[PDB]
Ligand binder design. Sequence first.
Ligand SMILES: NC(=O)C1=CN([C@@H]2O[C@H](COP(=O)(O)OP(=O)(O)OC[C@H]3O[C@@H](n4cnc5c(N)ncnc54)[C@H](OP(=O)(O)O)[C@@H]3O)[C@@H](O)[C@H]2O)C=CC1
Ligand SMILES: [Zn+2]
Lengths: 342, 209, 87, 129, 145, 115, 96
Amino acid sequence: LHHALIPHGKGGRSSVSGIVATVFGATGFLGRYVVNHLGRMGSQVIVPYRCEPYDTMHLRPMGDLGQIIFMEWNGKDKDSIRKVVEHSNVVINLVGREWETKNFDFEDVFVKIPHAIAQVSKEAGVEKLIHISHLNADIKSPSRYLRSKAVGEKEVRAAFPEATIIKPSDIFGREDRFLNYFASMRWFGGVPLISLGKETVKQPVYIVDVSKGIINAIKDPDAKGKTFAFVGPNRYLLFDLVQYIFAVAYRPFLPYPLPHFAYRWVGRLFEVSPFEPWTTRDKVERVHMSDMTLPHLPGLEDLGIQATPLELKAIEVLRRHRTYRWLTSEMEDVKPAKTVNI
Amino acid sequence: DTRPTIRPRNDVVHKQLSAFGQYVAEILPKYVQQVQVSCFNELEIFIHPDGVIPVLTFLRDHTNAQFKSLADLTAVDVPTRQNRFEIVYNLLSLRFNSQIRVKTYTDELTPIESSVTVYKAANWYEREIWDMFGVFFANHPDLRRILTGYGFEGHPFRKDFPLSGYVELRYDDEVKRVVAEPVELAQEFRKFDLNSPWEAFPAYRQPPE
Amino acid sequence: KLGLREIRIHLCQRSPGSQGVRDFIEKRYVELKKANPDLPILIRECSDVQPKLWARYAFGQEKNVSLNNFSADQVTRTLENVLSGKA
Amino acid sequence: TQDTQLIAVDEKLDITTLTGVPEEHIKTRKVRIFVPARNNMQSGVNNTKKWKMEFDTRERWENPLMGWSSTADPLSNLVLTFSTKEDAVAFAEKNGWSFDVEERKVPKPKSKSYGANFSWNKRTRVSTK
Amino acid sequence: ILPGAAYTEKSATYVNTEGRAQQTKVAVTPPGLAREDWKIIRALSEIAGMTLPYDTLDQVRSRLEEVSPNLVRYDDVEGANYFQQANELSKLVNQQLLADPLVPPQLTIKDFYMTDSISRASQTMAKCVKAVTEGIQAVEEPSIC
Amino acid sequence: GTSVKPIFSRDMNEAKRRVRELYRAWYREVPNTVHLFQLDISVKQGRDKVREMFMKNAHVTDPRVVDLLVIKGKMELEETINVWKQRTHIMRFFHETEAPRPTDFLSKFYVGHDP
Amino acid sequence: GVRTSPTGEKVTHTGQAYDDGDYRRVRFSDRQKEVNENFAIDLIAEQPVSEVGSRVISCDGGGGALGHPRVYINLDKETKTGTCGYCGLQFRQPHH
Ligand SMILES: NC(=O)C1=CN([C@@H]2O[C@H](COP(=O)(O)OP(=O)(O)OC[C@H]3O[C@@H](n4cnc5c(N)ncnc54)[C@H](OP(=O)(O)O)[C@@H]3O)[C@@H](O)[C@H]2O)C=CC1
Ligand SMILES: [Zn+2]
């Protein structure tokens, strides 16, 4: 190890840990928390950004002065990535759009730029890489999300043989676009879950669990080339989350089955909005898709993190969607959803 | 003054205060252990911990004293003394424009019954001496914290308490709430040993011990 | 196993209790060396330590007896067994 | 002579719990006691007269940006002053710190002279003046 | 190679050639990944199975006392005696001599300079080695601040 | 020396007597503080936590000292129930933001050169 | 004057030089490594050497009150030219 990268301190904010992160697209949900965990023991992140610096303003108070640098970077440009990864012990990739964009497509955001950053990182001389994919990333899956994730996954793995791969099942948290997305369904009448959502199972993962799992993977010397997958402690049927999170939000639960083709029609209609679409056809069939149960891939328990229950850390997020009539209601009133055991 | 550099003295007040020192001394030989008038016409009444009401009530209502103004009361944490704390009241007399200082010794555990009855100005003047130092005041209306943070631990003015304390805050975005951690400074305090090895003014030199 | 390779005693200089070992190593130490030459006898002598035993066996085992206020004639007896049980 | 509902406690007085030094700063701090030795190129001795309360030094690392001495030892820059010693130790156990002392290195009486520099048999004849 | 600490960054016990024990104290801390001297031994013992019992600093001093009573008593000259007892075990050996003259390793001042690794590492103290070798010529460093 | 002042309690018997009802108050409050402070922790972990700080100093014998923590501990239950403290002031006891500190000798040795 | 490091990285007068990797260098990216072009060492070395014929010369440094504490540097060393500590500019005696 280099003389300037020897870790020191008690793992505090101004302590130095010798890890030099270069998290990509951290101006998002999970990128926020990993940087927050990255600044816990004082690891100088680079966090290249493309949006306005004001939207990146909130990341400053997660590290000592000069520990969180900000570098302008463009995905399409080649030298843009290289200019932020020359002096990085590790490189973390989190770039991903959950909807179609005119200037960036699912393919462009999931095979083009992760391969490009991986090949320059190996060329630059990085020591690690953490490319995240989806646990549901299947090459022949109906969703454009999962197939794009899969083709990029083999691309980065081929480009970087030692690139540790993370595939969390589904991410639930403060602004997950998953729990709040279900809560947002109240404004459009009843819940438009196809066939009452009785045929779909998911296993959500807490942010603190996955975000920690990143830097335990970073500090673990045996994670090079592994393909860790992060899943929650319990799975639940799709109809098993909907009423539970409605109940924990105390909102009027109105399930309403409807045909899938019309569900696709609604998804396309919401896509026509020039601004950020509320829903797209990709997430339309991604919701009803059921996660696998593959145990061969190592999990977060291998690194030494226990997967927190969905019902345990839920009051923090779903409390916002409650009204004044239930803002002070505890989680004793609600009951844990009917877990489907493996 | 033939020597404008040096500050002139005033013996007229000096022995008048000394006379008043003996005055209070003879009245309470059970309380007044030590009386001392310094060079700068300052009177000191060293009292026993039990005497916080009587001598102050004496100094407040007496015809020859009339000291009703509670200037301040403060502690002087001296580690090398068996009684670390030294509560030091200050009294002001409107009628005689003089100042009176009284001192009482204390350990961490020995209590002082509150002087709220004597001086009701002292109500808020224990809520911090309990905070900063930790000397508890008996039979007192409220002993709440008003200087230290809510739920802060320790008595910072104690000379064994570090300058930087133990807890440092930071807004943690994981929990959306400011939280405390063990302190770790950007730079440590470059303490200076500026006490000259050659003896200062020999007037107050300590006797051969 | 309990194979013996180090013998130590700890005595105080002027203590009456240590007079036993003090008489021991004064009169009866040179032939104790002659008894088994190849086994060093660390007789460490320090202040305000009662006459005390330290016999280091194999594997790292080290066992002791508290020969406090003993006499010269049985201290060799107290160490005959550790010579007898040297293996 | 001070009877106020008089009670008796024979336990050695410790106040650690109420003072609230964190539990990792109560046992892992080997507190050593000495009278500061005079700086050897300072003939004055108005420092070799009290006792201090210095701690054990902890890790001191350089700040990544500006080369500071960032230190996570809250208690490093703190020394007390004690006239005599048993109060200094009496201070030591009442908050229950790991405790040791060092005896005051009193200057031995130097038998000084000036005629020795000009002797007739003794070698104390100085070679320069 | 196990990176060990130096005497300035370790709470060491050193005994002088007259038997008195001295306790060193940590002035600076060991640089980089290096640890103290007995910490690595205890760490390897724990990882190799034969875990040593004394797990703290004070524990090793007590064990040091238990294996040597004079060692843990700092700044104290414990009396050593029984010189004639040592004499008796010297009479029976009778190894005659070797006739080469007593030449101390530090024959001149130059040999005094070069003793230990910290001495050989030190370049400023090596300037004096040049100084005694030739004179004053090169070791003259201007300082007119 | 041994003879000393009873700040509030003569004997260790009445020291626990001051601990008892104060624990009762420090037992009763948990459902209401967890409700109006709008936290996420459950009542039970609040209950067993109350035990936790009742434990660490359950080893002193001096009657003055123990009942000094009695008034010391008396001094936050009202600081909480009259909403004087903050959510950041009672999550502080629920030490959560720091990574687990090292317990085994190997873990300290790996982290750094500091006991 | 000022030199340049292998990474360009104009080396300051003190001699600071970030080595090849030295992750700390990333702070100079998209920014400039502030270095003072004027280097004191070679900006005084070329200054003319004073020639005063006396053993002791004051060295107030110009504007006595505004300068630096006046010294009384000696001028008897013929090997090298004696300079004030604070001023640094060099006094030499012409053939003593
Ligand atoms: N439940 C879930 O949502 C799960 C998601 N993932 C994957 O995690 C990744 C990130 O998730 P999350 O952080 O929540 O997503 P967000 O939408 O909250 O943030 C995505 C980030 O990607 C950046 N980004 C996207 N496209 C580009 C581009 N073309 N050029 C530059 N930056 C770009 C965004 O920049 P900007 O902020 O400026 O838009 C932002 O920083 C995605 O790939 C996602 O599929 C993995 C597991 C579960
Ligand atoms: Zn000058």
